[PDB]
Amino acid sequence: AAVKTLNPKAEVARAQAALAVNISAARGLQDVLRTNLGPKGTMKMLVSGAGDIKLTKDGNVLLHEMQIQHPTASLIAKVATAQDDITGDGTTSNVLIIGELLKQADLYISEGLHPRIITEGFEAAKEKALQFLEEVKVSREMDRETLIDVARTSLRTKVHAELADVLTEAVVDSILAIKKQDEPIDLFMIEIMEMKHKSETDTSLIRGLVLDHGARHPDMKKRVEDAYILTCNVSLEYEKTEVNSGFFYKSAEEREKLVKAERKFIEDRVKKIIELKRKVCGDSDKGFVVINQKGIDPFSLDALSKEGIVALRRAKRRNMERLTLACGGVALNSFDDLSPDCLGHAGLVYEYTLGEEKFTFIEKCNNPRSVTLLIKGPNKHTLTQIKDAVRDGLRAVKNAIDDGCVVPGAGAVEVAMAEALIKHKPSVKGRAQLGVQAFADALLIIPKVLAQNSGFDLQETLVKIQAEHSESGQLVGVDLNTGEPMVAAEVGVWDNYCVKKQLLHSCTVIATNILLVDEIMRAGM
Amino acid sequence: IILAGEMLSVAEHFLEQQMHPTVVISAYRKALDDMISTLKKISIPVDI
């Protein structure tokens, strides 16, 4: 090797060795991630070095938690990470399609064909496939039923059937709650709070907020029926002077006067809050809740509790906007001019205690633009799995809402797109028809893996589905219970159009780039 | 080999309970006698 002559302690894989290494790594990743695809997939166990336990079948989580030290594996992991970051779904299909593309390309490369022709065929097939995907998408009015169908199609593949059924309603209701007409959906306005005291089926949607902290004063009321919410970002604790003030006295009486007069600055703001509370509610019927992003010293807590005011300190920064949108008040950075119009309203505020941790509920809002999903489970790994599932479901529903189109699932679009590619292959000039055929065969991996996970045989199910599609022309997928061809649109198995487009683009790009790699070098030492 | 493994498994089942191994051994020997008798009963001759 030329490189080894300059750097003796350098590792080099060149010519067919680079292709062999890359394809072997891709095939290993594909073999690991085959069993994830579909609701009939196998659940995986990931034990960390510290002993933590994670149960998942998510492609991205599995890739990040596999003990792998391979370069091509890192490349595919980054591709899947981008897939998860943008669309939130399709990482397992991403890895499967990349691996199958590389394998089908190798099938022709090993017979003396140059990878450039395969890449040209890949680009032509990708263009035709994108055109077919545009042709086959189903534009629909995203009512509640379609969103429920999409959420089911995601969650059933992510979690248990009954848990998925509950999470469908939760996710769809939350998304419909936070969604403004003709406006991008902000997923930051859905707080994912997890509790660890009941069953997994107890996960629900609260039309309000749940805060992981409670009142720090024992005498504060534990339950307020009609509450005025004051979302503020004002420090209510003692603060040092920025210019190294210091005190100087000549007697104990002077020390007492200085002690009493050093709290006046905070006491003025506390008195402003108390005066506003008295003005707004002159009776004991209504309640007053103060949620502060900064700390509150015990003296201010006592002064507030003397007036029957519940005060929560050190709230999260996002909670300012969340409470502003849900309760309807306004976050305040000062009390220079505060009026009854700056106060939010909540129809019920109460505190919940779970072991050492305490939680505060804010429900019965008028029209909460920000809501929260409360994850409940007996184990930490159950909570993590449900969090991953609800993230996937929220991404799926948001994607479905974003563009009024949706694609039939169960691998039907893969089969139809492969058939269209086969039909279009003669129009491609040159030997790029081999690349087109390889792309179609790689696209056909999804029904194959679904048949494997459902327990059937690849060839029989695939030929049955392809024959049904050719004879009828409909979009027929894989029936995971019977193995017969089935129309995915009729049963309500929907896939995100953006997810499919991203899959095609990313898989084709990474496969083309990997196939053109002829040397792997490690000579930076 | 497979038969020995299976018999030892079904014996472990009883050993988990409060049965002494001697009772299991006696039952196994009686069963073996009956096995031999049944095999000799269901056999057929051959014209060599």
Partner: protein
């Protein structure tokens, strides 16, 4: 031809220390074996005839107990499936407080029978669905097995009778005395409002006199001594302060600026006069006892001694809050004299010595109060810790009874009836799930079997007799541990009863843990790191 290379793909890409287990034999059977071994380790402590276990953790700390949750907590469990089982047991302990050993036994039996079913030919999904169906059927059946209800909780005798069974599994020899003690302590607490707080029961452990000398006190006991000279008060008017018993100082920076000789000669005298005035102002309200959460100054202590004021210093803020709840006072943030509403009243505060330790007792006389304290005697620290665990179990049982008042027969009667009816239901269900349902029913036999094994009798005879009696129509018949031969008796007359919520939650959590373990198909374990604990655990 002398070595087997690693297969290309994932086998070569694995890290040096990682482990990958895939497939039935490599993953599911190994997990079932580990869970079965854990259940075997914890089995022998089940029931009143359970045997204590000396468990020594990594810090050479003794733990002699027959509490399954404590044993698992002090055990360095390493197998992750056993980790799920332990987490389920701990969740059961958190939710209810009793039934952890039931969770272990049921999960182990379920996983053993699941392994059997997988061996005979059933798939994992079919076993899981059968287990879930059988769990639903068991939860449907369970309310129909309720025999009696608490029907009152302000009483002493019947509350003690109810709590006897919960603290009969532990401290089997002497449970009537403990039942009476815990019943008195709980009845003092639990006012007209239906809310019952477990933390309102305090346990004080004083060594020397044997557990038969333990008592219940309507108040709080602190293992401290009075700071001042006064050591006994008969009509206490306690004033509680969260601030140190000293003149408060500026929070920014204190600097006594002296510019003349008169200021230098008068500063200390004026400070002392101010301290005396503050102490006398506090005393003039009638407060003859002062409790503070911070340090005590020398001059403040002197002037308190001058006016005959009893001083108690409590370092823990939790103790301060509990004392405020007990006496009815408000922890003042400053050293101002307390108004009449903020001053707490206790019928007697005095310094006493029990055995060797000096204690300060805030004693009431009415059979009421916010907080009640149980003083525990004994001859060993470990014995008192075990008695404390038994008291905790009894208090949790009382809290559960406050939540739900329904009860089911104990001693395996409920388990046997559940097994019988689940088997009857599964005999009618067609399809392959009948095997899983029948195995789920049979898994209930592990409770009476464990009870009989620990008691020292033949388990099979007891189980056969239980089936015969339950077929006759007696749903309240369980194992009689007061016999040298396999015998059964009605458990409603014997008063051996278990909380409905405990059985419900234990069954639910055990089934959930079993099916969660069964769901795992592949295991990818990283190399065990040598890090000094995760940063989350500090």
């Amino acid at each position: 031809a002398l070595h087997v290379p690693k297969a290309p793909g994932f086998a070569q890409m694995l890290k040096e220390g990682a482990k990958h287990f895939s497939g039935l034999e490599e993953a599911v059977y190994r997990n079932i074996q580990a869970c079965k071994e854990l259940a075997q380790t914890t089995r022998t402590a089940y029931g009143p005839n359970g045997m204590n276990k000396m468990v020594i953790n990594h810090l050479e700390k003794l733990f002699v107990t027959n509490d399954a949750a404590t044993i698992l907590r002090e055990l360095e469990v390493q197998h992750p499936a056993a980790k799920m089982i332990v987490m389920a047991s701990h969740m059961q302990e958190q939710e209810v407080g009793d039934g952890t050993n039931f969770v272990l036994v049921f999960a182990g039996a379920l996983l053993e029978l699941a392994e059997e079913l997988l061996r005979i030919g059933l798939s994992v999904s079919e076993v899981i669905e059968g287990y879930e169906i059988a769990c639903r059927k068991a939860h449907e059946i369970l309310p129909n097995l309720v025999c009696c209800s608490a029907k009152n909780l302000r009483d002493i005798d019947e509350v003690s009778s109810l709590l006897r069974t919960s603290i009969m599994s532990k401290q089997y020899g002497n449970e009537v005395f403990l039942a009476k003690l815990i019943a008195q302590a709980c009845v003092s607490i639990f006012p007209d409002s239906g809310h019952f707080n477990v933390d309102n029961i305090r346990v004080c452990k004083i060594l020397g006199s044997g557990i038969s000398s333990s008592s219940v006190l309507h108040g709080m006991v602190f293992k401290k001594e009075t700071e001042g000279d006064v050591t006994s008060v008969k009509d206490a008017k306690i004033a509680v302060y969260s601030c140190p018993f000293d003149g408060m100082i500026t929070e920014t920076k204190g600097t006594v600026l002296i510019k003349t000789a008169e200021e230098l000669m008068n500063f200390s005298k004026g400070e002392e006069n101010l301290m005396d005035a503050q102490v006398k102002a506090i005393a003039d309200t009638g407060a003859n006892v002062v409790v503070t959460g911070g340090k005590v100054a020398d001059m403040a202590l002197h002037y308190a001694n001058k006016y005959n004021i009893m001083l108690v210093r409590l370092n823990s803020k939790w103790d301060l809050r509990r004392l405020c709840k007990t006496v009815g006072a408000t922890a003042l943030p400053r050293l101002t004299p307390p108004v009449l509403e903020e001053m707490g009243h206790c019928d007697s505060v005095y310094l006493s010595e029990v055995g060797d330790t000096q204690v300060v007792v805030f004693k009431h006389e009415k059979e009421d109060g916010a907080i009640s304290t149980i003083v525990l005697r004994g001859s060993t620290d470990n014995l008192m810790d075990d008695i404390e665990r038994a008291v905790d179990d009894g208090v949790n049982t009382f809290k559960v009874l406050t939540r739900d008042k329904r009860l089911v027969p104990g001693g395996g009667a409920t388990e046997i009836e559940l097994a019988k009816q689940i088997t009857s239901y599964g005999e009618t269900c067609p399809g392959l799930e009948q095997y899983a349902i029948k195995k789920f029913a049979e898994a209930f036999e592990a409770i009476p079997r464990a009870l009989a094994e620990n008691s020292g009798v033949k388990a099979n005879e007891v189980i056969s007799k239980l089936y015969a009696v339950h077929q006759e129509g007696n749903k309240n018949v369980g194992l009689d541990i007061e016999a040298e031969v396999p015998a059964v008796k009605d458990m409603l007359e014997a008063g051996i009863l278990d909380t409905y919520l405990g059985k419900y939650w234990a069954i639910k959590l055990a089934t959930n843990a079993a099916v969660t373990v069964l769901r795992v198909d592949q295991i990818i374990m990283a190399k065990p790191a040598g890090g000094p604990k995760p940063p989350s655990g500090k």
